[PDB]
Structure 1
Amino acid sequence: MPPSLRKAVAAAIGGGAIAIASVLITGPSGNDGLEGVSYIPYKDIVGVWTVCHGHTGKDIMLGKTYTKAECKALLNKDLATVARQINPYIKVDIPETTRGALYSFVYNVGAGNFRTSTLLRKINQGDIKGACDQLRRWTYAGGKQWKGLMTRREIEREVCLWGQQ
């Protein structure tokens, strides 16, 4: 991963999985992460309304220009939600890096997908290294493989396996 991002994830470690994920999504500067940011609402490719760091919901004011602080508040809430949605399903102790990287993964890919993934089953069997490797299989959308996903998956993989080496 870029060295600034690496250092960023390093300092977030004391802050636990949530903070780790927040670095992955927003990046060191808070605007150069694996997710885009947008201060004004827009419809995505599936026609869902979205703003800030990829935030969707029934609470988007279409006429509003959002601040950096609003965007960060909303991410916090959404990450807490991801945690709520997936942590029940992780039946084993994993390191904070691994947890944070799965948050970032699930943020992108959705809770359903994760619940039925092979990645989870390898987590629940204690195969951490094997779970982190499953990430590379998640680069396909519209029967095309995406350079942007393959990169994201590589970076989430590094962090997922951060403790090992």
Structure 2
Amino acid sequence: GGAICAIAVMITIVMGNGNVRTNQAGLELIGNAEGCRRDPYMCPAGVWTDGIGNTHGVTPGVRKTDQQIAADWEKNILIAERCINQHFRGKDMPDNAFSAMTSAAFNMGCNSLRTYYSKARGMRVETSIHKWAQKGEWVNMCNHLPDFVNSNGVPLRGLKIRREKERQLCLTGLVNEH
């Protein structure tokens, strides 16, 4: 049967369009985290989801094109890429770091990468990952990806795993591959 769609096929379309910078490894990382579904489904705190983690333009029971789901994915990727470019010096970092960062922003949203609420200081303050990004210190930046593993103030095994996959990507080509 068929309800699950192919990430690999979505990757070739998005890469073919020539808009997204994030590389194959980044699209693979993002795609496998989310999975790919033509049928809209319900996540906790239920709001409908499409394709590859898409929640915009989603109508229950409405099955999307293969190309429409790539279109959707592209759009969400470019939002995440804008975050990295506008706020983390994306234009200056290499592709692997950029792609890992994009994956983080796709998942957590830009706001959560830029600042966090300091209970000590009683206000939101700049993150270390942003500090290191602005300094062009990519290795240090990458190595802060594991800071972002909480949901509703609780760490998730899945987010630990994800942030570590992102960190490994971020750093390839930046450190001894062995």
TM-score by length of 1: 0.77
8 Å Cα contact 2:84-2:101 kept in structure 1? no
What whole-Å deviation, never above 9, does each CA across 1:128-161 have from its counterpart, x for those lacking one? 1111111111112244322211111111001110
8 Å Cα contact 1:82-1:111 kept in structure 2? yes
Q: Cα RMSD over matched residues? A: 2.3
Alignment equivalent of 1:72, drawn from 70, 73, 76: 70
Instruction: Please identify runs of 4+ aligned residues in structure 1 that moved more than 3 A.
Output: none
What whole-Å deviation, never above 9, does each CA across 1:91-121 have from its counterpart, x for those lacking one? 3610011001101111100011122232111
Structure 1 residue 156 corresponds to structure 2 residue 166:
yes
- 1:1-165 matches, within 5 Å, as 17-20=21-24, 21-26=26-31, 33-57=32-56, 59-91=57-89, 93-116=92-115, 117-165=127-175
Task: Give the Cα–Cα distance (whole angstroms) in 1 for the partners of residues 50 and 143 of structure 2.
Answer: 31
Task: Give the Cα–Cα distance (whole angstroms) in 2 for the partners of residues 135 and 46 of structure 1.
Answer: 25
Classify the secondary structure of the residue corresponding to 1:73. helix
8 Å Cα contact 1:18-1:80 kept in structure 2? no
Q: Structure 2: which 5+ residue stretches go unaligned?
A: 1-10, 116-126
Classify the secondary structure of the residue corresponding to 2:33. coil
Higher radius of gyration, 1 or 2: 2
Task: Give the Cα–Cα distance (whole angstroms) in 2 for the partners of residues 44 and 60 of structure 1.
Answer: 13
Task: Give the Cα–Cα distance (whole angstroms) in 2 for the partners of residues 145 and 61 of structure 1.
Answer: 31
Deviation at 1:70, TM superposition (A): 2.5
Identity %, equivalent residues: 29
TM-score by length of 2: 0.72
8 Å Cα contact 1:122-1:130 kept in structure 2? yes
Q: Structure 1: which 5+ residue stretches go unaligned?
A: 1-7, 27-32
Classify the secondary structure of the residue corresponding to 1:100. helix
8 Å Cα contact 1:17-1:97 kept in structure 2? no
Deviation at 1:48, TM superposition (A): 2.2
8 Å Cα contact 2:23-2:96 kept in structure 1? no
**May I ask how many residue pairs the two structures share in their alignment?**
146
